Every structure is written in C-alpha cells, then in structure tokens.
C-alpha cells in the first residue's frame, strides 16, 4: 500500500488544484457574463430614447 | 544523483524533498529542519554506496518549502527533483554516466601516455635545476664591482696550486 | 617562440641585443594588430587553418561571438560543419586534413566554454557526436583536443 | 519623584493585568493553531487547562505524556518528568524555533 | 514553585482530539480520566475551548506559528520587567505583586471564564492582525513603565545630590 | 516511524492540502461575485451616458 497511498496523495493534490482552478474559472466566465448581462439593459434604453423622438 | 533515485524509488515501493548531502551534515540538517518546522516532518536518510548520504523530508504543508531549501542549499546539499518518473531520468542519466566515463578513459589514457616520456626524464630536468639554482645562489655571493665578479672565499693550502 | 626564449639569454655585444629586440617586436606586433573577425572568417572560408598568436587567445573569441549571429550563430555553425565534413570525407590522418581538426577543435572549445547557447548548436548540427569519435581517432594532439572539446560541452549540460 | 512614584505604581498595576490577559491570548491561540496544524481532522478539539496543586507539576506532566503521547508517535513518546531542554549544537535542539525532540502531543505549560 | 503562587495554581494547557484516550488506565473517558486519575483526583480541570479563526492558506499557517512563538516570549519578557519594577519600588505583598489575581479575581478562576476575552479582539476577525494588535498593546505598555521608571531613577539622583548641598 | 504511522500522517497530508484549498477556493469565488456586479454597473452607467 505504499505506492497506492502515494498515488492517492498525488490525486489529492490534483483535486486541490482543480478546486482552486474552478474558482478561477468562475471569475473568467463572470467577466464575460458582466458584458452579456449589461448588453440587455443598454438596448432597452436605446429604443425608449427613439420612441420619445418619434413623438417630437 | 543516480543513487538518490535508486534509494527513493525503493522507499516509495516499500511535498517531499529528495537530494544528496555529505554525511557529516545529516544530523545538523535534521536538527535545523526540526527546529524550523516544529515537528511536522518525516526525515529519513540512506547512505549512498568523501562519503555522502541521501535524505527524504516530507514537508507536510506549504509556506516553508522555499525555506527548507535555504537550509539544504546553505550547507551544500543538492536536491534532486524529478517530477516525471523514476525510470525515465535513470535512462537519460546512464546515457551520460558512460558517455562521460569514456571521456575519462580517453583523457586518462592520454595522461598515462604523456607520463611515459616524463617519468624517465625527471631525474635530468630536476638535477639540472637543483644545480642551476645552486650556481646562481653562489653567483649572488660575488661582488660585481667593475664589470667583473670578485670571488673571495676559503680554500685549504694543499689545494692552492691545484686551483692555480 | 625561438626569439622570445633568446631575449632572456642575450649576448655580450650590444648590437646583437638590438637585433634580438627589434625582430621580436615586428613578428608579435603584426599578427595581433589585424582585426579578430577578419582573421577568423579568412581561415574558415579558404578552408586552411593554423594556430596563430591571436587565433588562440581567449579575447579573440570573446569579441567575435556576437558578430557571428545572423541566423543563430551561422558562422560558428559553419565551423562545426567543417570539422564534421573533414572526418567523414577523404578519411583522417592525411597530413592536410589532420592540421585543420586540431585547430577547429581548439576554436570550438573556447566558443563553447564562453556561451552556454552553443550547446544547442552542437546538438542540432550533430557535432556533439563527431567529438566522441575524435577521442578514438589517432594522434596525441587530436585526442587531447577532443577531450578538451568534450569537457567544455559536458559542464553546461550537467553541473 | 513623588509625582512619578504614584503614577508609576498605578501604571505598572494596570499594565500588569493587561499584559497578563494578552499572554493568555497568545497561549490559547498558540495551542489551537498547533493542534490544527499537527492533527488535521476532527475540526473541533478537546481542550482543557488543568490546575496542578503546587510542586506536583512534574508527576502530572509524566502521567499525561504516558497517557496521550501515543497519538503523536510510537517512538516519539519517551518518559519525561520535568521540562527537558536541550540547546547543544544542531544535534540536540528543543524550542519551537528549532527542535529535534519535543512533546509528542500538543502541550504548553503556563507558570506565573 | 511555592512563593510565586499565593492564591494561583500552576497550569498545563493541552489539546487533544475528541477521539483521544488515555493508555495509563484504559477504558476511561478522557474527561473522567482528568478528574479521577490525574494526580490522586486533586486536579482541577476547567474548559478552555476557543472557537475557530479564519485561516487563509497552508503557507500562511506556518508564518502564524512563527509569530505566536516570538511574541509570546516577548510578552513573557514584558511581564518580567513590570514585576521587577514593582519589587524595585518596594511593593511586595503576601498575595500580590508576585502572584496578583487577575483583576482581583483568583487566577485559576480567571482561566475558567477565559473563553476568548474581548477587549478589541474579535472571533470573526482575521488571525494575523489580532496577533499584531496584542503584541503592539504590550509593547507600548512596556515602553511606558520603563520610560517612567528611568525618570524616577534620575529624579532620585537630584534629591540625593541636593541633600548634601543643604547639610553634609 | 513504522510504515503504518507514516501512512496515518500521509492521510493527514492530503487532508491538509485539500482543506486549505477549499478555504482558498471559497475566498477566490467570493471576490468573483463582488466583481461581476460592480463590472456590470460600471458598463451600464458609461453607456447610458453615451446614449444620453
């Protein structure tokens, strides 16, 4: 069980790195999401500013 | 470096640092790492067979891993990090041991070729200098007055006519 | 070399001394005072190589390394190519080809010992193997130069 | 001198109590920090402060070393009664600075 | 000790897993062992469980242990100085200034309600800064008592010198 | 020590490595939620100024 144990320890270290990287992956995505979820608020203001123009 | 791989693949077959060290510094490295990491280590040693020694540390954790290396590299310990395999570096290292042993067998053959013409000639080159320095040490004892040396010294009266 | 030895062991008459000193100056002055880059390029191109006073100096190489670069030390690479060529073509231990090898090998040690990047060049061209054969190839100056050529390479690969 | 004298006795007294609470802070935190770092799981520890009646400290420490030391290591529990202290070269060292022998289980001793 | 206690007792702080067991006399509960077995049942056992601290990383943990150790000697040092200054002044009691109940409340008793005291130390704060605050506090106090005594010793020299000028 | 004892500590090792990393990873993703909102408000205020 010596080299069976080392490999579990080794796996333990990858699982830890993956856990850390997963949180970093979250932020990366959240940076693209911030642009996505900001694009929907903007174009709804754009067609309202045209509406009150079509009135004038 | 071959032996600290052979004696640390065997330890796994029966956060860790593997390297070489002189044997007279193993106990002081054990004590300094035990006083740095309060406990928190599993320190082994296996004699490489100047005499040297291997060591395994198992630095259980982080934030001192670059500080254990400042203990090892201070008292002239050479860490051997592998990180790939204990069977792939051994081939690339035995491909250098014999490749450099052949350069030993070339240059030492050239050395023993050169020493043949010298070992039978040193009693001439040495005995030239031993008397040439003895000539100039005696020529320092003369006068050098008027572009000619004056040698004043003693000789027995029986050997006066032999000098003359 | 003969003149330099003479200078220590001078002859009583003054005029003799003057001749020893004046001759000594021209021979020595003349070789060193020519540009380092010129001398190296001139020998490699014509394919005729011989040791000379500034051609064996450490300084000669030190100045000339940077200059070589044009396509990853293209000139140095041509030299390794010349050492390689000579051994394979026309055999070895023929008077001409044997002179060049000792010189080519002296030049390559100094350059290699100087710059660690040279190690890639031996490997790419395939000069590193050629040197291992040269230890085995006859004559004392040849195996001597090959051993020096090998020790400079080794030092940077594995310390 | 008189003005300094009143001020100084008062200040020492106030300082004393404060320096004492801070000392006990460090020790409590130093046993928690040590315990998590050496033992790991389980998250919560069973911590006690045992008051030893005077001059029986040694015999107390020995009954603890023998009782609990096994957890630390089978060879790492030796019999000791009284604080063993070593400081000779790097072949014998005892301190939290550097050590090559210590308590096998987490123990700090507090004396006033 | 027998003069450096007069209403205190001496303490051992230990921490064990809640899975620890005694092998002095097996089969016993750790809690039961401390009371019954440890030096003839004379042992007074008090709780000292302090809650969690935030811990940022594995590397940083190591660095925390370093700070805890040095400061703790430094604070021990600082108490050594304060007690030395009280004796110097000629303040000695049979129950104070060489024992001194914490806030005029016995020492074993103070530790029994020491379950992490709050004076500007918070159990939801980061660990590192708290270590620094405790050490800063003590250091400043230490400078204060030292500085005041220096001026006391100097002031005494002026009085002594002056007494000879008026009659001697 | 004995291989068994050294394996109890081994188990502890991978425990530590995992726990400090989960703790690190929670802080890391919590800065990522503060950052989402804040970046989103900043894009919007800039843009409505242009539209204005």
Curated annotation (Swiss-Prot), chain B:
Segments forming a coiled coil: 65-115
**What modifications follow translation?**
Glycosylated.
Q: Which pairs are disulfide-linked?
A: none
Q: Subcellular location, in the record's words?
A: Endosome membrane; Golgi apparatus membrane
Briefly state the protein's biological role: Subunit of the V0 complex of vacuolar(H+)-ATPase (V-ATPase), a multisubunit enzyme composed of a peripheral complex (V1) that hydrolyzes ATP and a membrane integral complex (V0) that translocates protons. V-ATPase is responsible for acidifying and maintaining the pH of intracellular compartments. Is present only in Golgi- and endosome-residing V-ATPase complexes; enzymes containing this subunit have a 4-fold lower ratio of proton transport to ATP hydrolysis than complexes containing the vacuolar isoform and do not dissociate V1 and V0 in response to glucose depletion.
The subunit field of the Swiss-Prot or TrEMBL record says: V-ATPase is a heteromultimeric enzyme composed of a peripheral catalytic V1 complex (components A to H) attached to an integral membrane V0 proton pore complex (components: a, c, c', c'', d, e, f and VOA1).
Name the family the entry cites.
Answer: Belongs to the V-ATPase 116 kDa subunit family.
The record's misc note reads: Present with 1084 molecules/cell in log phase SD medium.
Q: What is this protein called?
A: V-type proton ATPase subunit a, Golgi isoform
Species of provenance:
Saccharomyces cerevisiae (strain ATCC 204508 / S288c) (Baker's yeast)
Location of this fragment in the whole protein: 150 to 396 of 890
From Swiss-Prot, chain D:
What's the domain of life for this entry?
Eukaryota
Please indicate which part of the intact protein appears here, giving the first and last residue numbers and the full length: 281 to 392 of 392
Q: What else is known?
A: Present with 21114 molecules/cell in log phase SD medium.
Provide the GO MF annotations for this entry: ATP binding; proton-transporting ATPase activity, rotational mechanism
* A single BP term in Gene Ontology: vacuolar acidification
**What family name appears in the similarity comment?**
Belongs to the V-ATPase C subunit family.
Whichever gene encodes this chain, its name is VMA5
Q: Does the keyword Ion transport apply?
A: yes
How is the subunit organization of this protein annotated in UniProt?
A: V-ATPase is a heteromultimeric enzyme composed of a peripheral catalytic V1 complex (components A to H) attached to an integral membrane V0 proton pore complex (components: a, c, c', c'', d, e, f and VOA1). Interacts directly with VMA4.
The name on file for this protein is: V-type proton ATPase subunit C
Name one cellular component (GO) term: proton-transporting V-type ATPase complex
> What does the function comment of this entry state?
Subunit of the V1 complex of vacuolar(H+)-ATPase (V-ATPase), a multisubunit enzyme composed of a peripheral complex (V1) that hydrolyzes ATP and a membrane integral complex (V0) that translocates protons. V-ATPase is responsible for acidifying and maintaining the pH of intracellular compartments. Subunit C is necessary for the assembly of the catalytic sector of the enzyme and is likely to have a specific function in its catalytic activity. Reversibly leaves the enzyme after glucose depletion, causing the catalytic subcomplex V1 to detach from the V0 section.
Q: What keywords were assigned to this record?
A: Acetylation, ATP-binding, Hydrogen ion transport, Ion transport, Membrane, Nucleotide-binding, Transport, Vacuole
Q: Kindly list the places in or outside the cell where this protein is found, as annotated in its UniProt entry.
A: Vacuole membrane
Key word Acetylation present in the record? yes
From Swiss-Prot, chain E:
* Record note on quaternary structure: V-ATPase is a heteromultimeric enzyme composed of a peripheral catalytic V1 complex (components A to H) attached to an integral membrane V0 proton pore complex (components: a, c, c', c'', d, e, f and VOA1). Interacts directly with VMA4.
UniProt modified residues of type N-acetylalanine: 2
Protein name as annotated = V-type proton ATPase subunit C
Q: Its gene?
A: VMA5
Q: Which residues of the parent protein does this chain contain?
A: 1 to 168 of 392
Q: What else is known?
A: Present with 21114 molecules/cell in log phase SD medium.
Q: Where in the cell is it found?
A: Vacuole membrane
Function text: Subunit of the V1 complex of vacuolar(H+)-ATPase (V-ATPase), a multisubunit enzyme composed of a peripheral complex (V1) that hydrolyzes ATP and a membrane integral complex (V0) that translocates protons. V-ATPase is responsible for acidifying and maintaining the pH of intracellular compartments. Subunit C is necessary for the assembly of the catalytic sector of the enzyme and is likely to have a specific function in its catalytic activity. Reversibly leaves the enzyme after glucose depletion, causing the catalytic subcomplex V1 to detach from the V0 section.
Family membership: Belongs to the V-ATPase C subunit family.
UniProtKB/Swiss-Prot annotation, chain F:
Annotated region Interaction with VMA10: the residues are: 12-31
**What pairs make up the disulfide bonds?**
none
What changing residue 2 to A does, per the record, is:
Increases ATPase activity 1.4-fold
Q: Point out the coiled-coil segments of this chain.
A: 8-38
Region: Interaction with VMA5; residue ranges are 1-13
Question: Which compartment or compartments is the protein found in?
Answer: Vacuole membrane
Q: State the family it belongs to.
A: Belongs to the V-ATPase E subunit family.
The subunit structure is: Homodimer. V-ATPase is a heteromultimeric enzyme composed of a peripheral catalytic V1 complex (components A to H) attached to an integral membrane V0 proton pore complex (components: a, c, c', c'', d, e, f and VOA1). Interacts with VMA5; the interaction is direct. Interacts with VMA10; the interaction is direct. Interacts with RAV1 and RAV2 components of the RAVE complex, which are essential for the stability and assembly of V-ATPase.
Q: What else is known?
A: Present with 16134 molecules/cell in log phase SD medium.
This molecule's function is given as:
Subunit of the V1 complex of vacuolar(H+)-ATPase (V-ATPase), a multisubunit enzyme composed of a peripheral complex (V1) that hydrolyzes ATP and a membrane integral complex (V0) that translocates protons. V-ATPase is responsible for acidifying and maintaining the pH of intracellular compartments.
User: What's the protein name?
Assistant: V-type proton ATPase subunit E
State the species of origin: Saccharomyces cerevisiae (strain ATCC 204508 / S288c) (Baker's yeast)
> What gene makes this protein?
VMA4
Q: Where the shown chain sits in the full protein?
A: 8 to 59 of 233
């Amino acid at each position: 069980s010596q080299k069976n144990g080392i490999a579990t320890l080794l796996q333990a270290e990858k699982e830890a790195h993956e856990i850390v990287s997963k949180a970093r992956k979250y932020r990366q995505d959240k940076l693209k999401q911030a642009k996505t979820d900001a694009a929907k608020e903007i174009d709804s203001y754009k067609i309202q500013k045209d509406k009150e123009l079509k009135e004038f | 470096q071959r032996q600290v791989i052979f004696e640390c693949s065997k330890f796994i077959e029966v956060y860790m640092i593997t390297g070489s060290i002189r044997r007279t510094k193993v106990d002081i490295l054990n004590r300094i790492l035990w006083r740095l990491l309060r406990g928190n280590l599993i320190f082994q040693n296996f004699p490489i067979e100047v005499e040297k020694d291997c060591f395994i540390i198992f630095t259980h954790g982080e934030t001192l891993l670059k500080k254990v290396k400042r203990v090892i590299d201070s008292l002239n310990g050479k860490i051997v990090s592998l990180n790939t395999r204990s069977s792939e570096l051994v081939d690339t290292l035995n491909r250098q041991i014999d490749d450099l042993q052949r350069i030993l067998d070339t240059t030492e053959q050239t050395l023993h070729t050169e020493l043949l013409v010298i070992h039978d000639q040193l009693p001439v080159w040495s005995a030239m200098t031993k008397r040439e320095k003895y000539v100039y040490t005696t020529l320092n004892k003369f006068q050098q007055e008027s572009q000619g040396l004056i040698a004043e010294g003693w000789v027995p009266s029986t050997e006066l006519i032999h000098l003359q | 070399p003969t003149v330099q030895s003479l200078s220590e062991r001078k002859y009583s008459d003054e005029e003799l001394r003057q001749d020893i000193s004046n001759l000594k100056e021209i021979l020595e002055n003349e070789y060193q005072e020519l540009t380092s880059f010129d001398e190296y390029v001139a020998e490699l191109d014509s394919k005729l190589l011989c040791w000379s006073p500034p051609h064996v100096d450490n300084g000669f190489w030190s100045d000339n390394i940077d200059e070589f670069k044009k396509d990853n030390y293209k000139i140095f690479r041509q030299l390794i190519e010349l050492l390689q060529a000579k051994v394979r073509n026309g055999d070895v231990n023929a008077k001409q080809e044997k002179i060049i090898i000792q010189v080519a090998l002296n030049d390559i040690t100094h350059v290699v010992e100087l710059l660690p990047e040279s190690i890639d060049v031996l490997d790419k061209t395939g000069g590193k193997a050629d040197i291992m054969e040269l230890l085995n190839h006859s004559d004392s100056r040849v195996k001597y130069e090959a051993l020096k050529a090998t020790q400079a390479i080794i030092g940077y690969t594995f310390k | 001198e008189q003005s300094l004298r009143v001020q100084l006795v008062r200040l020492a007294k106030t300082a004393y109590v404060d320096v004492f609470i801070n000392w006990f802070h460090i020790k409590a935190l130093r046993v928690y920090v040590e315990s998590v770092l050496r033992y790991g799981l389980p998250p919560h520890f069973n911590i006690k402060i045992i008051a030893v009646p005077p001059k029986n400290l040694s015999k107390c420490k020995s009954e603890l070393i023998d009782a609990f030391g096994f957890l630390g290591g089978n060879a790492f529990m030796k019999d000791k009664k009284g604080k063993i202290n070593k400081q000779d070269t790097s072949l014998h060292q005892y301190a939290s600075l550097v050590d090559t022998e210590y308590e096998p289980f987490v123990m700090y001793i507090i004396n006033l | 000790m027998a003069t450096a206690l007069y209403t205190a007792n001496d303490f051992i702080l230990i921490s064990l897993p809640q899975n620890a067991q005694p092998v002095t006399a097996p089969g016993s509960k750790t809690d039961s062992w401390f009371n019954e077995t440890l030096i003839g049942g004379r042992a007074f056992v008090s709780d000292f469980k302090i809650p969690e601290f935030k811990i940022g990383s594995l590397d940083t943990l190591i660095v925390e242990s370093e700070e805890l150790s040095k400061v703790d000697n430094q604070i021990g040092a600082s108490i050594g100085k304060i007690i030395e200054i009280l004796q110097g002044l000629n303040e000695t009691s049979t129950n104070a200034y060489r024992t001194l109940p914490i806030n005029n409340m016995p020492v074993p008793e103070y530790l029994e309600n020491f379950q992490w005291q709050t004076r500007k130390f918070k159990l939801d704060k980061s660990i590192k800064d708290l270590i620094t605050l405790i050490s800063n506090e003590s250091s400043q106090l230490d400078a204060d008592v030292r500085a005041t005594y220096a001026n006391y010793n100097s002031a005494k020299t002026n009085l002594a010198a002056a007494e000879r000028k008026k009659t001697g | 020590l004995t291989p068994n004892q050294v394996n109890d500590e081994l188990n502890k090792m991978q425990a530590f490595i995992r726990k400090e990393a989960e703790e690190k990873a929670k802080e890391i993703q919590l800065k990522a939620d503060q950052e989402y909102e804040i970046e989103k408000t900043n894009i919007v205020r800039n843009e409505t100024n242009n539209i204005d």
